[PDB]
Design a protein around this motif. Sequence first.
Motif, PDB file in Angstrom:
ATOM      1  N   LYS A  44     -35.849  54.329  13.800  1.00  0.00           N
ATOM      2  CA  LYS A  44     -35.111  53.763  12.674  1.00  0.00           C
ATOM      3  C   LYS A  44     -35.965  52.920  11.762  1.00  0.00           C
ATOM      4  O   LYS A  44     -35.518  52.629  10.642  1.00  0.00           O
ATOM      5  CB  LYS A  44     -33.890  52.930  13.113  1.00  0.00           C
ATOM      6  CG  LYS A  44     -32.953  53.779  13.990  1.00  0.00           C
ATOM      7  CD  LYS A  44     -31.508  53.846  13.457  1.00  0.00           C
ATOM      8  CE  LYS A  44     -30.619  54.651  14.438  1.00  0.00           C
ATOM      9  NZ  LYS A  44     -29.866  53.742  15.327  1.00  0.00           N
ATOM     10  N   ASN A  45     -37.160  52.515  12.212  1.00  0.00           N
ATOM     11  CA  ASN A  45     -38.087  51.774  11.316  1.00  0.00           C
ATOM     12  C   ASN A  45     -39.160  52.690  10.698  1.00  0.00           C
ATOM     13  O   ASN A  45     -40.146  52.209  10.141  1.00  0.00           O
ATOM     14  CB  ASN A  45     -38.794  50.680  12.086  1.00  0.00           C
ATOM     15  CG  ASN A  45     -37.819  49.799  12.800  1.00  0.00           C
ATOM     16  OD1 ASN A  45     -37.749  49.817  14.002  1.00  0.00           O
ATOM     17  ND2 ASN A  45     -36.992  49.106  12.049  1.00  0.00           N
ATOM     18  N   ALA A  50     -46.913  36.459  15.251  1.00  0.00           N
ATOM     19  CA  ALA A  50     -46.082  37.643  15.077  1.00  0.00           C
ATOM     20  C   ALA A  50     -46.058  37.895  13.572  1.00  0.00           C
ATOM     21  O   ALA A  50     -46.076  36.931  12.776  1.00  0.00           O
ATOM     22  CB  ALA A  50     -44.644  37.410  15.587  1.00  0.00           C
ATOM     23  N   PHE A  51     -46.074  39.167  13.193  1.00  0.00           N
ATOM     24  CA  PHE A  51     -46.043  39.485  11.803  1.00  0.00           C
ATOM     25  C   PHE A  51     -45.269  40.728  11.468  1.00  0.00           C
ATOM     26  O   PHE A  51     -45.266  41.704  12.247  1.00  0.00           O
ATOM     27  CB  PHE A  51     -47.468  39.571  11.197  1.00  0.00           C
ATOM     28  CG  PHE A  51     -48.457  40.463  11.971  1.00  0.00           C
ATOM     29  CD1 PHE A  51     -49.044  40.025  13.173  1.00  0.00           C
ATOM     30  CD2 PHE A  51     -48.830  41.693  11.445  1.00  0.00           C
ATOM     31  CE1 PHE A  51     -50.007  40.809  13.852  1.00  0.00           C
ATOM     32  CE2 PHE A  51     -49.799  42.542  12.106  1.00  0.00           C
ATOM     33  CZ  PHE A  51     -50.398  42.087  13.304  1.00  0.00           C
ATOM     34  N   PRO A  90     -46.358  52.459  21.022  1.00  0.00           N
ATOM     35  CA  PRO A  90     -45.150  51.589  20.839  1.00  0.00           C
ATOM     36  C   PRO A  90     -44.829  50.717  22.085  1.00  0.00           C
ATOM     37  O   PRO A  90     -45.198  51.054  23.191  1.00  0.00           O
ATOM     38  CB  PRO A  90     -44.031  52.638  20.685  1.00  0.00           C
ATOM     39  CG  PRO A  90     -44.457  53.699  21.789  1.00  0.00           C
ATOM     40  CD  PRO A  90     -45.988  53.799  21.554  1.00  0.00           C
ATOM     41  N   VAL A  91     -44.150  49.596  21.898  1.00  0.00           N
ATOM     42  CA  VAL A  91     -43.577  48.850  23.028  1.00  0.00           C
ATOM     43  C   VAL A  91     -42.799  49.783  23.988  1.00  0.00           C
ATOM     44  O   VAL A  91     -41.999  50.546  23.536  1.00  0.00           O
ATOM     45  CB  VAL A  91     -42.605  47.766  22.484  1.00  0.00           C
ATOM     46  CG1 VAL A  91     -41.617  47.280  23.546  1.00  0.00           C
ATOM     47  CG2 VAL A  91     -43.411  46.592  21.813  1.00  0.00           C
ATOM     48  N   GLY A  92     -42.980  49.680  25.300  1.00  0.00           N
ATOM     49  CA  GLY A  92     -42.353  50.628  26.198  1.00  0.00           C
ATOM     50  C   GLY A  92     -43.312  51.754  26.616  1.00  0.00           C
ATOM     51  O   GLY A  92     -43.159  52.322  27.697  1.00  0.00           O
ATOM     52  N   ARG A 133     -36.146  45.508  14.372  1.00  0.00           N
ATOM     53  CA  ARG A 133     -36.994  46.511  15.027  1.00  0.00           C
ATOM     54  C   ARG A 133     -36.486  46.585  16.410  1.00  0.00           C
ATOM     55  O   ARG A 133     -36.359  45.539  17.040  1.00  0.00           O
ATOM     56  CB  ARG A 133     -38.451  46.068  15.003  1.00  0.00           C
ATOM     57  CG  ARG A 133     -39.105  46.408  13.638  1.00  0.00           C
ATOM     58  CD  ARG A 133     -38.647  45.603  12.411  1.00  0.00           C
ATOM     59  NE  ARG A 133     -39.737  45.632  11.430  1.00  0.00           N
ATOM     60  CZ  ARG A 133     -39.824  44.893  10.330  1.00  0.00           C
ATOM     61  NH1 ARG A 133     -38.818  44.051  10.030  1.00  0.00           N
ATOM     62  NH2 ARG A 133     -40.954  44.967   9.544  1.00  0.00           N
ATOM     63  N   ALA A 134     -36.188  47.787  16.898  1.00  0.00           N
ATOM     64  CA  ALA A 134     -35.533  47.870  18.207  1.00  0.00           C
ATOM     65  C   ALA A 134     -36.016  49.110  18.918  1.00  0.00           C
ATOM     66  O   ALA A 134     -35.951  50.219  18.360  1.00  0.00           O
ATOM     67  CB  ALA A 134     -33.971  47.902  18.033  1.00  0.00           C
ATOM     68  N   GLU A 172     -35.015  44.523   8.195  1.00  0.00           N
ATOM     69  CA  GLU A 172     -34.397  45.367   9.232  1.00  0.00           C
ATOM     70  C   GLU A 172     -34.796  44.880  10.618  1.00  0.00           C
ATOM     71  O   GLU A 172     -35.907  44.392  10.811  1.00  0.00           O
ATOM     72  CB  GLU A 172     -34.907  46.818   9.108  1.00  0.00           C
ATOM     73  CG  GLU A 172     -36.435  46.949   9.107  1.00  0.00           C
ATOM     74  CD  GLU A 172     -36.908  48.275   8.484  1.00  0.00           C
ATOM     75  OE1 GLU A 172     -37.035  48.250   7.264  1.00  0.00           O
ATOM     76  OE2 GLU A 172     -37.116  49.332   9.191  1.00  0.00           O
ATOM     77  N   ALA A 177     -42.383  50.318   9.499  1.00  0.00           N
ATOM     78  CA  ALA A 177     -42.243  48.862   9.286  1.00  0.00           C
ATOM     79  C   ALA A 177     -42.097  48.159  10.647  1.00  0.00           C
ATOM     80  O   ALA A 177     -40.968  47.971  11.133  1.00  0.00           O
ATOM     81  CB  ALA A 177     -41.017  48.598   8.404  1.00  0.00           C
ATOM     82  N   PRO A 178     -43.217  47.921  11.350  1.00  0.00           N
ATOM     83  CA  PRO A 178     -43.109  47.260  12.663  1.00  0.00           C
ATOM     84  C   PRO A 178     -43.053  45.756  12.534  1.00  0.00           C
ATOM     85  O   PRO A 178     -43.207  45.204  11.443  1.00  0.00           O
ATOM     86  CB  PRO A 178     -44.459  47.601  13.360  1.00  0.00           C
ATOM     87  CG  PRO A 178     -45.119  48.658  12.441  1.00  0.00           C
ATOM     88  CD  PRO A 178     -44.589  48.377  11.083  1.00  0.00           C
ATOM     89  N   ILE A 179     -42.903  45.113  13.682  1.00  0.00           N
ATOM     90  CA  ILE A 179     -43.267  43.716  13.840  1.00  0.00           C
ATOM     91  C   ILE A 179     -44.263  43.723  14.994  1.00  0.00           C
ATOM     92  O   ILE A 179     -43.973  44.244  16.109  1.00  0.00           O
ATOM     93  CB  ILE A 179     -42.003  42.892  14.174  1.00  0.00           C
ATOM     94  CG1 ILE A 179     -41.045  42.806  12.971  1.00  0.00           C
ATOM     95  CG2 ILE A 179     -42.344  41.473  14.850  1.00  0.00           C
ATOM     96  CD1 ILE A 179     -39.791  41.867  13.146  1.00  0.00           C
ATOM     97  N   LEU A 193     -43.857  46.447  17.823  1.00  0.00           N
ATOM     98  CA  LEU A 193     -42.481  46.779  18.054  1.00  0.00           C
ATOM     99  C   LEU A 193     -41.832  47.480  16.823  1.00  0.00           C
ATOM    100  O   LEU A 193     -41.691  46.884  15.754  1.00  0.00           O
ATOM    101  CB  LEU A 193     -41.734  45.536  18.477  1.00  0.00           C
ATOM    102  CG  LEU A 193     -40.521  45.736  19.411  1.00  0.00           C
ATOM    103  CD1 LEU A 193     -40.144  44.389  20.148  1.00  0.00           C
ATOM    104  CD2 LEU A 193     -39.341  46.170  18.568  1.00  0.00           C
ATOM    105  N   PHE A 194     -41.385  48.723  17.004  1.00  0.00           N
ATOM    106  CA  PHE A 194     -40.686  49.487  15.939  1.00  0.00           C
ATOM    107  C   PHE A 194     -40.050  50.685  16.654  1.00  0.00           C
ATOM    108  O   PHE A 194     -40.614  51.141  17.664  1.00  0.00           O
ATOM    109  CB  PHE A 194     -41.698  50.007  14.883  1.00  0.00           C
ATOM    110  CG  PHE A 194     -42.800  50.901  15.462  1.00  0.00           C
ATOM    111  CD1 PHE A 194     -43.913  50.345  16.089  1.00  0.00           C
ATOM    112  CD2 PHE A 194     -42.700  52.324  15.370  1.00  0.00           C
ATOM    113  CE1 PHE A 194     -44.898  51.145  16.696  1.00  0.00           C
ATOM    114  CE2 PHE A 194     -43.701  53.145  15.938  1.00  0.00           C
ATOM    115  CZ  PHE A 194     -44.802  52.558  16.608  1.00  0.00           C
ATOM    116  N   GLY A 195     -38.921  51.200  16.164  1.00  0.00           N
ATOM    117  CA  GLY A 195     -38.485  52.496  16.696  1.00  0.00           C
ATOM    118  C   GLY A 195     -38.327  53.521  15.559  1.00  0.00           C
ATOM    119  O   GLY A 195     -38.736  53.277  14.402  1.00  0.00           O
ATOM    120  N   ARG A 213     -48.726  43.864  20.847  1.00  0.00           N
ATOM    121  CA  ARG A 213     -47.535  44.731  21.063  1.00  0.00           C
ATOM    122  C   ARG A 213     -46.967  45.076  19.671  1.00  0.00           C
ATOM    123  O   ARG A 213     -46.819  44.140  18.815  1.00  0.00           O
ATOM    124  CB  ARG A 213     -46.468  44.036  21.921  1.00  0.00           C
ATOM    125  CG  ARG A 213     -47.045  43.525  23.194  1.00  0.00           C
ATOM    126  CD  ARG A 213     -46.033  42.998  24.208  1.00  0.00           C
ATOM    127  NE  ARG A 213     -45.286  44.079  24.880  1.00  0.00           N
ATOM    128  CZ  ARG A 213     -43.951  44.151  24.860  1.00  0.00           C
ATOM    129  NH1 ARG A 213     -43.247  43.216  24.199  1.00  0.00           N
ATOM    130  NH2 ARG A 213     -43.314  45.144  25.500  1.00  0.00           N
TER     131      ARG A 213
END
Lengths: 124, 124
Positions: B119-120, B79-80, B39-41, A72-73, A70, B96-98, B115-117, B113
Amino acid sequence: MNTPEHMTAVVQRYVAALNAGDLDGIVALFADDATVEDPVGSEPRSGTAAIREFYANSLKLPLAVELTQEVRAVANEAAFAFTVSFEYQGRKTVVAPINHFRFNGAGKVVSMRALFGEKNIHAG
Amino acid sequence: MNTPEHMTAVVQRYVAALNAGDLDGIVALFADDATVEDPVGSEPRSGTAAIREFYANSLKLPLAVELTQEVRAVANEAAFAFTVSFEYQGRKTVVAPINHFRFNGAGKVVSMRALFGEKNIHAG
Ligand SMILES: C[C@]12CCc3c(ccc4cc(O)ccc34)[C@@H]1CCC2=O
């Protein structure tokens, strides 16, 4: 802020454009003053002309590109895992990066960074 | 430059320390001037005290963390992709981030950082 739906749509478009060899389609995703750093640690190409030439060059051989998880956004950024597959002189390669897009207020990509090293390049 | 092997090993140690609830172990991987943005942001946590607090907060619930693909690592960055699961009052949540690390010349993480929103994230 960009929506996660829009950013995820953009990632899917980007993958489909690479599969089709659709150069205009890839370039149309980016802002006029975007930058591409691919791979990470390499020198950034910036602006439409450099980025279009980057992608034209990346399309010399047919690519098979898949999203492998998926997207990530969040905020104004997305990150995604994928593989790019190609064959040259009867040698098959599969590169498996994680890319990062940042998006501007108009929903174009102003920045791509492609993170992968030698460990992430594999045989067919 | 950091080797990809050292960065990869740190990602693994990070993941193992989260599973163990090992706070000192996590924080020993960061430079004392590191930042975490998660989270990022959100507003980046900066420095050893804010970093240790961010992690001690994360560790209020037992976490089950696992890498879900190979680590990407190049230059001084990794990155993972992974999942982190936790449960509070029989409600289980899977995210489920990255994540992205940058490493300094000493081999310590100077920036993460996640990254996930929404939706993850899956809660049920
Ligand atoms: C922060 C984190 C990534 C995301 C995350 C963690 C723990 C609990 C979480 C709970 C959430 O609702 C959303 C994200 C997380 C991980 C702990 C270590 C790490 O890298």
